[PDB]
Amino acid sequence: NFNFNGLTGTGVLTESNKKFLPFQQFGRDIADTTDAVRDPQTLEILDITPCSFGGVSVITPGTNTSNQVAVLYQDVNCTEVTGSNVFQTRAGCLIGAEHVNNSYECDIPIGAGICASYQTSQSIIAYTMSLGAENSVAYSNNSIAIPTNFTISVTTEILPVSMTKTS
Amino acid sequence: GKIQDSLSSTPSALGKLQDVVNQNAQALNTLVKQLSSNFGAISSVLNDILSRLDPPEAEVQIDRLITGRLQSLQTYVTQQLIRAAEIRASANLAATKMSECVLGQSKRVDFCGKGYHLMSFPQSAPHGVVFLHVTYVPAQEKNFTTAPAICHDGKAHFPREGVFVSNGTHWFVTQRNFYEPQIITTDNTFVSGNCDVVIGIVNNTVYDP
Amino acid sequence: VDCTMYICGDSTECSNLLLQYGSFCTQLNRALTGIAVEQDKNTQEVFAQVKQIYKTPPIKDFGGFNFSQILPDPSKPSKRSPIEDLLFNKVTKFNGLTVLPPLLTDEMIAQYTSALLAGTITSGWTFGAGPALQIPFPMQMAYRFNGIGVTQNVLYENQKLIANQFNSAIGKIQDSLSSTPSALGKLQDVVNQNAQALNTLVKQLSSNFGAISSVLNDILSRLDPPEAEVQIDRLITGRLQSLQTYVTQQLIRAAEIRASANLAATKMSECVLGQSKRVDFCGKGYHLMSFPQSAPHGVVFLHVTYVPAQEKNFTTA
Ligand SMILES: *[C@@H]1O[C@H](CO)[C@@H](O[C@@H]2O[C@H](CO)[C@@H](O[C@@H]3O[C@H](CO)[C@@H](O)[C@H](O)[C@@H]3O)[C@H](O)[C@H]2NC(C)=O)[C@H](O)[C@H]1NC(C)=O
Ligand SMILES: *[C@@H]1O[C@H](CO)[C@@H](O[C@@H]2O[C@H](CO)[C@@H](O)[C@H](O)[C@H]2NC(C)=O)[C@H](O)[C@H]1NC(C)=O
Ligand SMILES: *[C@@H]1O[C@H](CO)[C@@H](O[C@@H]2O[C@H](CO)[C@@H](O)[C@H](O)[C@H]2NC(C)=O)[C@H](O)[C@H]1NC(C)=O
Ligand SMILES: *[C@@H]1O[C@H](CO)[C@@H](O[C@@H]2O[C@H](CO)[C@@H](O)[C@H](O)[C@H]2NC(C)=O)[C@H](O)[C@H]1NC(C)=O
Ligand SMILES: *[C@@H]1O[C@H](CO)[C@@H](O[C@@H]2O[C@H](CO)[C@@H](O)[C@H](O)[C@H]2NC(C)=O)[C@H](O)[C@H]1NC(C)=O
Ligand SMILES: *[C@@H]1O[C@H](CO)[C@@H](O[C@@H]2O[C@H](CO)[C@@H](O)[C@H](O)[C@H]2NC(C)=O)[C@H](O)[C@H]1NC(C)=O
Ligand SMILES: *[C@@H]1O[C@H](CO)[C@@H](O)[C@H](O)[C@H]1NC(C)=O
Ligand SMILES: *[C@@H]1O[C@H](CO)[C@@H](O)[C@H](O)[C@H]1NC(C)=O
Ligand SMILES: *[C@@H]1O[C@H](CO)[C@@H](O)[C@H](O)[C@H]1NC(C)=O
């Protein structure tokens, strides 16, 4: 909780790569939020990183299967949140889950290409999204694929039509 | 029959409509709970504020409650108007799908599902519509030799129907969609231009039936 | 945007007052969470139209047609095509704001895009019914031509010209997008509107809304506590009004963005993964083919159509 010459805020203050005139004392962001100070005694420019915040996202198995739950802390590093099963994701700090290098389909989304699911001896695993199987179709300019026989698939589609007539 | 079994064992399959009824229930539950809020006022209960405070102050506290309640109601109405726009858009799409796949046969791509559209059947639903959209999907994608044309008498012959294919001995014409070959005959081809016009053209027999 | 942070900076006196307003604020969080969920659905509806990932073969034996400017570049950090590099190069806190990443990222969108492009190039309309079929590019054109009422003989007489005209048109678009960045303004406006909505909340936050002071530590040290609480309620109402305005604008815009996403998804299915007969739907001319590109919070398509060269006068009956 900082106070520099009467100007306050809460954050992490580290060396800045900004330059300033001998004249100036503080840097400013939108709506005049301070984003830098120079120290009053030490002639260094210091960058104010807002203290980390985000929501808490809980990865829940079906409760009809298990009680194994992992927690994702948004917009934070696993230096600030931890526990023993601690892995850093792009979305946030993930604790209680393990990571796997292989890609798979997506059941429980983390963000930034990372998605969780449950696999077996079952645990909570974060995976790279595969976006589906690859189809290694061969190709030439003198051959064609033309099917023999067909089947019927039926798609069930549900659409909203109306709402409760409230007043 | 498989759809009925699926809907029975997996009720979440109908979630797109369950969400509509849940959103409206929540909007109403939101107003009722906010109603009990004092919005920073001395008391949220009207009979209590009137017996608790001398009338001219109670009136001030009442204006604070009135503004807070009116804000809750305006929020509700705004949410219902935005949702009304979303629901109307869904209703318009649903109406479109019924006309396009149930009361006619649309050529729109993947419009009522993947596959070739065959038929569709509406169902009523609690504040919504459900459709079973029936389409065709190919069973097995077999590899055949092809050409844009074959030539005879030095001229290029194109299909009037489907595509030209070959089994390694003879040229046949199949449908664009399925491998049901006809021997290429003069009666079912179009002739225009020299053999050499078509890149990939094959020299072969065109039969007289 | 969380009121606790936006309004109080986690301070106790205004926090207790916020708790009294209650669900009046938590409903704002629900609306914004709902929008964020829909934003991933929009990206998926527009790009995840392939059930499998399809790829362009090692040898581009496509009848003289250059798809190299639309297909992804294997040598880059992000597998973006030359045209995608232009689209991305040209189109661009303790105040309660949290911003989350998309589930589906530019690289993963590019992977779906690669499948969509490989699909339209080697399978075309067969991509719309089961596993995609393999078709020679000139044969794919024969179907595309017959589909607009023009016999395939036409394309063979003009195949060299069609390939040259196609290749030129794609190259001219890239030159146009490079020299005229405003060409992509329909998407630049989306990112600008959301930036403005956030900038609007931050600036309104400093407003006193007619109160003695907009600074919480100042109102508490300046006025005896029971008055400071009154001034705090004035700030809370003003800030909650700013947040409700923001949420309302984001909900209305969410409806507009979803409508655009639905149209974009429609165009991909109609002009990329099949051949639509809708009039002027993906542009003026007879529809021939179309290619998607990823874009920063949007989609760009190159819609390829035919236009007659010379309208000659003949006798008819
Ligand atoms: C406020 O007073 C502090 C003293 O606490 C001043 O810091 C002092 O600055 C002098 C001049 O640079 C330092 O002397 C020299 O420092 C350099 C590097 O620190 C060293 O290599 C030399 O051998 C010599 O000691 C002195 O060490 C330094 N003291 C501390 C504790 O840092 C500061 O300059 C004053 N600020 C202003 C704005 O006047
Ligand atoms: C018919 O074409 C299909 C294209 O999907 C072939 O499938 C691939 O073919 C290559 C070489 O022919 C194989 O190396 C790949 O493993 C196949 N990929 C998949 C996903 O199956 C198929 O093999 C061809 N069939 C015949 C009999 O040639
Ligand atoms: C595309 O079809 C062309 C014919 O129009 C093929 O070109 C020749 O094909 C024969 C037999 O397949 C080969 O002996 C020649 O060497 C080919 N010539 C050239 C210049 O390639 C071509 O092979 C076909 N392409 C593919 C990928 O199958
Ligand atoms: C390709 O199909 C043709 C059909 O026209 C085959 O030719 C026939 O062969 C059968 C027996 O295999 C005979 O009974 C017919 O009299 C033949 N028809 C004609 C018109 O000659 C041909 O054998 C097939 N080739 C391959 C490699 O399967
Ligand atoms: C088709 O694409 C190929 C890609 O190898 C083009 O070859 C290069 O294309 C780039 C940009 O498209 C140019 O800057 C180079 O001058 C091209 N030639 C090289 C590297 O030798 C090829 O020109 C394209 N064909 C067309 C446009 O007809
Ligand atoms: C059809 O139109 C095309 C393009 O407008 C013409 O092709 C051009 O022909 C000129 C001859 O002067 C060449 O210099 C160009 O290189 C060609 N352009 C392309 C893209 O191929 C063609 O001449 C026209 N055909 C007829 C019969 O009018
Ligand atoms: C925090 O995680 C981010 C991932 O975006 C990484 O770039 C950064 O180096 C990490 N910081 C620390 C202090 O570990
Ligand atoms: C995943 O990759 C990391 C980094 O290369 C490596 O250390 C680790 O052994 C890999 N894990 C598996 C299960 O392959
Ligand atoms: C096929 O006929 C054409 C006539 O234009 C001729 O040029 C070509 O040599 C013939 N091909 C073969 C293999 O006989």
Tab-separated table of N, CA, C and O in Angstrom, chain C residues 126-216:
chain	number	residue	atom	x	y	z
C	126	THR	N	-18.700	-31.328	-50.989
C	126	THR	CA	-18.846	-32.680	-50.452
C	126	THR	C	-18.515	-32.673	-48.966
C	126	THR	O	-18.828	-33.608	-48.229
C	127	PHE	N	-17.951	-31.559	-48.510
C	127	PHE	CA	-17.531	-31.321	-47.148
C	127	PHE	C	-18.794	-31.187	-46.285
C	127	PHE	O	-18.753	-31.268	-45.049
C	128	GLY	N	-19.919	-30.893	-46.946
C	128	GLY	CA	-21.200	-30.685	-46.303
C	128	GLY	C	-21.968	-31.981	-45.994
C	128	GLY	O	-23.049	-31.911	-45.409
C	129	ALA	N	-21.460	-33.161	-46.387
C	129	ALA	CA	-22.222	-34.384	-46.128
C	129	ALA	C	-21.324	-35.568	-45.825
C	129	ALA	O	-20.921	-36.281	-46.738
C	130	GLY	N	-20.999	-35.780	-44.553
C	130	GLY	CA	-20.099	-36.866	-44.200
C	130	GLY	C	-18.669	-36.454	-44.413
C	130	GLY	O	-18.376	-35.262	-44.498
C	131	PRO	N	-17.739	-37.413	-44.372
C	131	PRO	CA	-16.330	-37.202	-44.553
C	131	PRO	C	-16.204	-36.551	-45.900
C	131	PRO	O	-16.949	-36.886	-46.819
C	132	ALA	N	-15.288	-35.625	-46.021
C	132	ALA	CA	-15.120	-34.939	-47.278
C	132	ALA	C	-14.563	-35.884	-48.350
C	132	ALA	O	-13.767	-36.776	-48.039
C	133	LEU	N	-14.969	-35.682	-49.610
C	133	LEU	CA	-14.489	-36.469	-50.746
C	133	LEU	C	-13.322	-35.777	-51.409
C	133	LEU	O	-13.200	-34.563	-51.337
C	134	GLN	N	-12.463	-36.545	-52.056
C	134	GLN	CA	-11.352	-35.985	-52.812
C	134	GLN	C	-11.727	-35.695	-54.270
C	134	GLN	O	-12.158	-36.589	-54.998
C	135	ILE	N	-11.579	-34.428	-54.685
C	135	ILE	CA	-11.879	-33.984	-56.047
C	135	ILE	C	-10.712	-33.153	-56.672
C	135	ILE	O	-10.278	-32.179	-56.060
C	136	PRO	N	-10.222	-33.455	-57.896
C	136	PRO	CA	-9.179	-32.703	-58.599
C	136	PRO	C	-9.612	-31.268	-58.663
C	136	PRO	O	-10.790	-31.017	-58.876
C	137	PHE	N	-8.716	-30.304	-58.541
C	137	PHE	CA	-9.259	-28.956	-58.514
C	137	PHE	C	-10.117	-28.628	-59.747
C	137	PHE	O	-11.223	-28.120	-59.575
C	138	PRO	N	-9.692	-28.900	-61.005
C	138	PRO	CA	-10.480	-28.622	-62.194
C	138	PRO	C	-11.825	-29.351	-62.203
C	138	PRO	O	-12.750	-28.939	-62.903
C	139	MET	N	-11.940	-30.449	-61.449
C	139	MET	CA	-13.188	-31.182	-61.398
C	139	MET	C	-14.074	-30.495	-60.401
C	139	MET	O	-15.299	-30.493	-60.542
C	140	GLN	N	-13.443	-29.881	-59.397
C	140	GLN	CA	-14.194	-29.181	-58.396
C	140	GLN	C	-14.809	-27.998	-59.102
C	140	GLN	O	-15.969	-27.659	-58.850
C	141	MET	N	-14.042	-27.397	-60.027
C	141	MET	CA	-14.570	-26.286	-60.787
C	141	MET	C	-15.684	-26.752	-61.690
C	141	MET	O	-16.707	-26.092	-61.774
C	142	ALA	N	-15.579	-27.942	-62.280
C	142	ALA	CA	-16.671	-28.397	-63.127
C	142	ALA	C	-17.967	-28.437	-62.351
C	142	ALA	O	-19.010	-28.008	-62.859
C	143	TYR	N	-17.907	-28.846	-61.089
C	143	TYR	CA	-19.136	-28.887	-60.331
C	143	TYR	C	-19.593	-27.464	-59.987
C	143	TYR	O	-20.790	-27.166	-60.085
C	144	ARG	N	-18.639	-26.582	-59.649
C	144	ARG	CA	-18.935	-25.194	-59.283
C	144	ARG	C	-19.571	-24.427	-60.460
C	144	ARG	O	-20.459	-23.598	-60.268
C	145	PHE	N	-19.116	-24.707	-61.676
C	145	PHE	CA	-19.666	-24.103	-62.885
C	145	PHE	C	-21.044	-24.634	-63.228
C	145	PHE	O	-21.987	-23.861	-63.454
C	146	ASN	N	-21.224	-25.948	-63.131
C	146	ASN	CA	-22.508	-26.518	-63.482
C	146	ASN	C	-23.556	-25.998	-62.484
C	146	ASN	O	-24.706	-25.720	-62.853
C	147	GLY	N	-23.117	-25.738	-61.244
C	147	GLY	CA	-23.932	-25.245	-60.146
C	147	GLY	C	-24.484	-23.828	-60.336
C	147	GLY	O	-25.412	-23.437	-59.614
C	148	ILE	N	-23.941	-23.065	-61.295
C	148	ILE	CA	-24.406	-21.709	-61.574
C	148	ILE	C	-25.043	-21.625	-62.949
C	148	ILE	O	-25.292	-20.528	-63.450
C	149	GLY	N	-25.316	-22.776	-63.570
C	149	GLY	CA	-25.939	-22.772	-64.881
C	149	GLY	C	-24.967	-22.530	-66.032
C	149	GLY	O	-25.373	-22.024	-67.084
C	150	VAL	N	-23.679	-22.810	-65.832
C	150	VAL	CA	-22.705	-22.617	-66.884
C	150	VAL	C	-22.038	-23.970	-67.117
C	150	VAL	O	-21.424	-24.508	-66.209
C	151	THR	N	-22.111	-24.515	-68.318
C	151	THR	CA	-21.539	-25.853	-68.505
C	151	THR	C	-20.056	-25.871	-68.267
C	151	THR	O	-19.334	-24.990	-68.728
C	152	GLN	N	-19.566	-26.965	-67.691
C	152	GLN	CA	-18.148	-27.113	-67.404
C	152	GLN	C	-17.265	-26.921	-68.640
C	152	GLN	O	-16.125	-26.483	-68.507
C	153	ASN	N	-17.787	-27.137	-69.850
C	153	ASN	CA	-16.968	-26.923	-71.055
C	153	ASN	C	-16.373	-25.518	-71.084
C	153	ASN	O	-15.313	-25.283	-71.678
C	154	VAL	N	-17.094	-24.582	-70.488
C	154	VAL	CA	-16.744	-23.191	-70.441
C	154	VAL	C	-15.466	-22.983	-69.670
C	154	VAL	O	-14.672	-22.104	-70.020
C	155	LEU	N	-15.307	-23.706	-68.562
C	155	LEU	CA	-14.155	-23.459	-67.745
C	155	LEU	C	-12.958	-24.055	-68.418
C	155	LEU	O	-11.864	-23.544	-68.288
C	156	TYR	N	-13.149	-25.132	-69.173
C	156	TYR	CA	-11.988	-25.745	-69.785
C	156	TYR	C	-11.488	-24.876	-70.923
C	156	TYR	O	-10.289	-24.615	-71.014
C	157	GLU	N	-12.407	-24.259	-71.678
C	157	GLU	CA	-12.000	-23.348	-72.749
C	157	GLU	C	-11.220	-22.178	-72.153
C	157	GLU	O	-10.238	-21.699	-72.729
C	158	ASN	N	-11.639	-21.750	-70.968
C	158	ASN	CA	-11.029	-20.651	-70.259
C	158	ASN	C	-10.206	-21.083	-69.034
C	158	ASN	O	-9.899	-20.238	-68.206
C	159	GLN	N	-9.771	-22.340	-68.890
C	159	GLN	CA	-9.090	-22.669	-67.619
C	159	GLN	C	-7.844	-21.858	-67.345
C	159	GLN	O	-7.557	-21.517	-66.192
C	160	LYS	N	-7.072	-21.561	-68.379
C	160	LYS	CA	-5.857	-20.795	-68.163
C	160	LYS	C	-6.219	-19.395	-67.699
C	160	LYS	O	-5.531	-18.806	-66.858
C	161	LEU	N	-7.312	-18.865	-68.246
C	161	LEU	CA	-7.739	-17.521	-67.935
C	161	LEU	C	-8.340	-17.457	-66.557
C	161	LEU	O	-8.105	-16.499	-65.834
C	162	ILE	N	-9.066	-18.493	-66.167
C	162	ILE	CA	-9.711	-18.528	-64.873
C	162	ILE	C	-8.640	-18.565	-63.809
C	162	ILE	O	-8.746	-17.856	-62.808
C	163	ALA	N	-7.621	-19.411	-63.996
C	163	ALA	CA	-6.551	-19.475	-63.020
C	163	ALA	C	-5.822	-18.142	-62.921
C	163	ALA	O	-5.552	-17.675	-61.814
C	164	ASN	N	-5.592	-17.461	-64.058
C	164	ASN	CA	-4.883	-16.191	-64.012
C	164	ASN	C	-5.714	-15.092	-63.359
C	164	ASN	O	-5.178	-14.274	-62.600
C	165	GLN	N	-7.021	-15.078	-63.632
C	165	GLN	CA	-7.923	-14.076	-63.089
C	165	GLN	C	-8.086	-14.257	-61.596
C	165	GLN	O	-8.125	-13.279	-60.846
C	166	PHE	N	-8.169	-15.516	-61.164
C	166	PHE	CA	-8.283	-15.827	-59.764
C	166	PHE	C	-7.049	-15.383	-59.019
C	166	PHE	O	-7.143	-14.664	-58.018
C	167	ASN	N	-5.879	-15.765	-59.540
C	167	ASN	CA	-4.630	-15.485	-58.875
C	167	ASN	C	-4.404	-13.987	-58.758
C	167	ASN	O	-3.929	-13.499	-57.719
C	168	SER	N	-4.788	-13.249	-59.802
C	168	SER	CA	-4.645	-11.815	-59.807
C	168	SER	C	-5.566	-11.187	-58.784
C	168	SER	O	-5.123	-10.385	-57.962
C	169	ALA	N	-6.839	-11.595	-58.755
C	169	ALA	CA	-7.767	-10.971	-57.828
C	169	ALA	C	-7.333	-11.147	-56.376
C	169	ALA	O	-7.431	-10.200	-55.586
C	170	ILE	N	-6.785	-12.312	-56.020
C	170	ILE	CA	-6.382	-12.493	-54.632
C	170	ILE	C	-5.207	-11.560	-54.334
C	170	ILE	O	-5.183	-10.909	-53.278
C	171	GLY	N	-4.238	-11.487	-55.256
C	171	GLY	CA	-3.084	-10.616	-55.071
C	171	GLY	C	-3.464	-9.135	-54.974
C	171	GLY	O	-2.892	-8.399	-54.162
C	172	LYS	N	-4.472	-8.708	-55.745
C	172	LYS	CA	-4.887	-7.313	-55.712
C	172	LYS	C	-5.548	-6.992	-54.381
C	172	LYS	O	-5.375	-5.885	-53.863
C	173	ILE	N	-6.263	-7.954	-53.799
C	173	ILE	CA	-6.846	-7.724	-52.490
C	173	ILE	C	-5.774	-7.531	-51.458
C	173	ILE	O	-5.903	-6.647	-50.612
C	174	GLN	N	-4.733	-8.347	-51.494
C	174	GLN	CA	-3.673	-8.164	-50.528
C	174	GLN	C	-3.025	-6.782	-50.674
C	174	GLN	O	-2.785	-6.109	-49.665
C	175	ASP	N	-2.823	-6.304	-51.917
C	175	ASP	CA	-2.210	-4.986	-52.083
C	175	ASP	C	-3.120	-3.902	-51.528
C	175	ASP	O	-2.653	-2.950	-50.889
C	176	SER	N	-4.428	-4.068	-51.743
C	176	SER	CA	-5.419	-3.117	-51.278
C	176	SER	C	-5.465	-3.056	-49.764
C	176	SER	O	-5.461	-1.968	-49.187
C	177	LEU	N	-5.457	-4.211	-49.101
C	177	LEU	CA	-5.528	-4.215	-47.649
C	177	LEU	C	-4.277	-3.612	-47.035
C	177	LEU	O	-4.344	-2.992	-45.972
C	178	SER	N	-3.132	-3.827	-47.681
C	178	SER	CA	-1.867	-3.298	-47.210
C	178	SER	C	-1.806	-1.769	-47.287
C	178	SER	O	-1.406	-1.107	-46.319
C	179	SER	N	-2.214	-1.190	-48.431
C	179	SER	CA	-2.151	0.263	-48.588
C	179	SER	C	-3.349	1.020	-48.012
C	179	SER	O	-3.227	2.204	-47.678
C	180	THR	N	-4.483	0.343	-47.841
C	180	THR	CA	-5.697	0.956	-47.337
C	180	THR	C	-6.220	0.198	-46.111
C	180	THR	O	-7.203	-0.530	-46.220
C	181	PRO	N	-5.641	0.382	-44.902
C	181	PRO	CA	-5.981	-0.354	-43.688
C	181	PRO	C	-7.430	-0.139	-43.256
C	181	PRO	O	-8.028	-0.998	-42.607
C	182	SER	N	-8.027	0.971	-43.709
C	182	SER	CA	-9.403	1.342	-43.402
C	182	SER	C	-10.390	0.367	-44.027
C	182	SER	O	-11.562	0.303	-43.639
C	183	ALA	N	-9.894	-0.448	-44.954
C	183	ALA	CA	-10.648	-1.461	-45.658
C	183	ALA	C	-11.186	-2.501	-44.687
C	183	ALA	O	-12.149	-3.196	-44.992
C	184	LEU	N	-10.535	-2.626	-43.530
C	184	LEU	CA	-10.879	-3.588	-42.500
C	184	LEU	C	-11.626	-2.939	-41.336
C	184	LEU	O	-11.823	-3.571	-40.283
C	185	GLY	N	-12.094	-1.700	-41.545
C	185	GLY	CA	-12.755	-0.890	-40.528
C	185	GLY	C	-13.937	-1.571	-39.856
C	185	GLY	O	-14.130	-1.428	-38.653
C	186	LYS	N	-14.666	-2.430	-40.559
C	186	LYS	CA	-15.794	-3.083	-39.902
C	186	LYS	C	-15.365	-3.867	-38.663
C	186	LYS	O	-16.159	-4.026	-37.735
C	187	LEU	N	-14.131	-4.385	-38.638
C	187	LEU	CA	-13.677	-5.107	-37.468
C	187	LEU	C	-12.961	-4.159	-36.510
C	187	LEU	O	-13.089	-4.284	-35.287
C	188	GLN	N	-12.267	-3.155	-37.048
C	188	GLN	CA	-11.550	-2.214	-36.180
C	188	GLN	C	-12.554	-1.500	-35.276
C	188	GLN	O	-12.271	-1.233	-34.108
C	189	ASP	N	-13.754	-1.262	-35.789
C	189	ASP	CA	-14.803	-0.632	-35.012
C	189	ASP	C	-15.214	-1.484	-33.807
C	189	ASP	O	-15.641	-0.941	-32.794
C	190	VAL	N	-15.106	-2.814	-33.885
C	190	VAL	CA	-15.560	-3.669	-32.795
C	190	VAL	C	-14.626	-3.524	-31.631
C	190	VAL	O	-15.048	-3.371	-30.475
C	191	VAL	N	-13.341	-3.576	-31.945
C	191	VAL	CA	-12.349	-3.470	-30.900
C	191	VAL	C	-12.346	-2.050	-30.321
C	191	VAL	O	-12.130	-1.878	-29.114
C	192	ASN	N	-12.640	-1.036	-31.159
C	192	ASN	CA	-12.677	0.328	-30.675
C	192	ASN	C	-13.863	0.544	-29.750
C	192	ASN	O	-13.713	1.195	-28.720
C	193	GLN	N	-15.023	-0.044	-30.071
C	193	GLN	CA	-16.200	0.124	-29.231
C	193	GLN	C	-16.022	-0.487	-27.863
C	193	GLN	O	-16.432	0.115	-26.866
C	194	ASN	N	-15.366	-1.646	-27.787
C	194	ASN	CA	-15.192	-2.252	-26.485
C	194	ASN	C	-14.150	-1.479	-25.685
C	194	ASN	O	-14.304	-1.306	-24.470
C	195	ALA	N	-13.110	-0.962	-26.354
C	195	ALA	CA	-12.123	-0.182	-25.637
C	195	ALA	C	-12.758	1.075	-25.070
C	195	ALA	O	-12.499	1.435	-23.920
C	196	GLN	N	-13.652	1.698	-25.845
C	196	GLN	CA	-14.327	2.900	-25.412
C	196	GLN	C	-15.250	2.618	-24.254
C	196	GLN	O	-15.311	3.410	-23.315
C	197	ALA	N	-15.953	1.483	-24.275
C	197	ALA	CA	-16.863	1.174	-23.185
C	197	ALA	C	-16.096	1.060	-21.864
C	197	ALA	O	-16.543	1.575	-20.827
C	198	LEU	N	-14.906	0.456	-21.913
C	198	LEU	CA	-14.090	0.340	-20.716
C	198	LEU	C	-13.486	1.670	-20.304
C	198	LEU	O	-13.405	1.978	-19.109
C	199	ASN	N	-13.098	2.487	-21.280
C	199	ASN	CA	-12.507	3.770	-20.964
C	199	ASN	C	-13.557	4.666	-20.332
C	199	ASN	O	-13.247	5.486	-19.461
C	200	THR	N	-14.807	4.491	-20.761
C	200	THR	CA	-15.930	5.239	-20.242
C	200	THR	C	-16.126	4.917	-18.771
C	200	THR	O	-16.214	5.843	-17.961
C	201	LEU	N	-16.094	3.628	-18.389
C	201	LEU	CA	-16.234	3.333	-16.965
C	201	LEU	C	-15.111	3.883	-16.130
C	201	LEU	O	-15.350	4.362	-15.015
C	202	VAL	N	-13.890	3.812	-16.638
C	202	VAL	CA	-12.776	4.269	-15.837
C	202	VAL	C	-12.839	5.769	-15.616
C	202	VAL	O	-12.559	6.246	-14.519
C	203	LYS	N	-13.166	6.531	-16.650
C	203	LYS	CA	-13.268	7.963	-16.477
C	203	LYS	C	-14.451	8.360	-15.582
C	203	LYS	O	-14.303	9.230	-14.718
C	204	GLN	N	-15.607	7.682	-15.715
C	204	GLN	CA	-16.774	8.013	-14.886
C	204	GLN	C	-16.507	7.691	-13.435
C	204	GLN	O	-16.955	8.397	-12.542
C	205	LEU	N	-15.663	6.710	-13.182
C	205	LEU	CA	-15.311	6.340	-11.833
C	205	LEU	C	-14.761	7.523	-11.018
C	205	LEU	O	-14.976	7.592	-9.799
C	206	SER	N	-14.035	8.456	-11.664
C	206	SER	CA	-13.425	9.587	-10.959
C	206	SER	C	-14.433	10.692	-10.622
C	206	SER	O	-14.109	11.636	-9.882
C	207	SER	N	-15.630	10.610	-11.205
C	207	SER	CA	-16.687	11.581	-11.008
C	207	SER	C	-17.241	11.517	-9.611
C	207	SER	O	-17.317	10.450	-9.001
C	208	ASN	N	-17.592	12.671	-9.073
C	208	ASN	CA	-18.207	12.721	-7.766
C	208	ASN	C	-19.719	12.587	-7.852
C	208	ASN	O	-20.399	12.456	-6.840
C	209	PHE	N	-20.275	12.681	-9.057
C	209	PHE	CA	-21.726	12.608	-9.241
C	209	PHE	C	-22.470	13.612	-8.338
C	209	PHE	O	-23.537	13.302	-7.790
C	210	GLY	N	-21.861	14.790	-8.152
C	210	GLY	CA	-22.363	15.894	-7.328
C	210	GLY	C	-21.984	15.800	-5.824
C	210	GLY	O	-22.309	16.701	-5.047
C	211	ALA	N	-21.307	14.722	-5.424
C	211	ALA	CA	-20.882	14.445	-4.045
C	211	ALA	C	-19.715	15.339	-3.621
C	211	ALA	O	-19.013	15.929	-4.443
C	212	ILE	N	-19.477	15.420	-2.320
C	212	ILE	CA	-18.381	16.239	-1.805
C	212	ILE	C	-17.005	15.817	-2.335
C	212	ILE	O	-16.164	16.677	-2.601
C	213	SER	N	-16.742	14.522	-2.418
C	213	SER	CA	-15.461	14.043	-2.928
C	213	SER	C	-15.619	12.680	-3.557
C	213	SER	O	-16.371	11.854	-3.054
C	214	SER	N	-14.912	12.444	-4.672
C	214	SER	CA	-14.930	11.149	-5.361
C	214	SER	C	-13.896	10.176	-4.823
C	214	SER	O	-13.854	9.007	-5.219
C	215	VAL	N	-13.038	10.659	-3.943
C	215	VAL	CA	-11.996	9.826	-3.395
C	215	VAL	C	-12.484	9.274	-2.068
C	215	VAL	O	-12.942	10.029	-1.213
C	216	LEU	N	-12.431	7.954	-1.916
C	216	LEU	CA	-12.950	7.321	-0.713
C	216	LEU	C	-12.137	7.611	0.532
C	216	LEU	O	-12.691	7.926	1.584
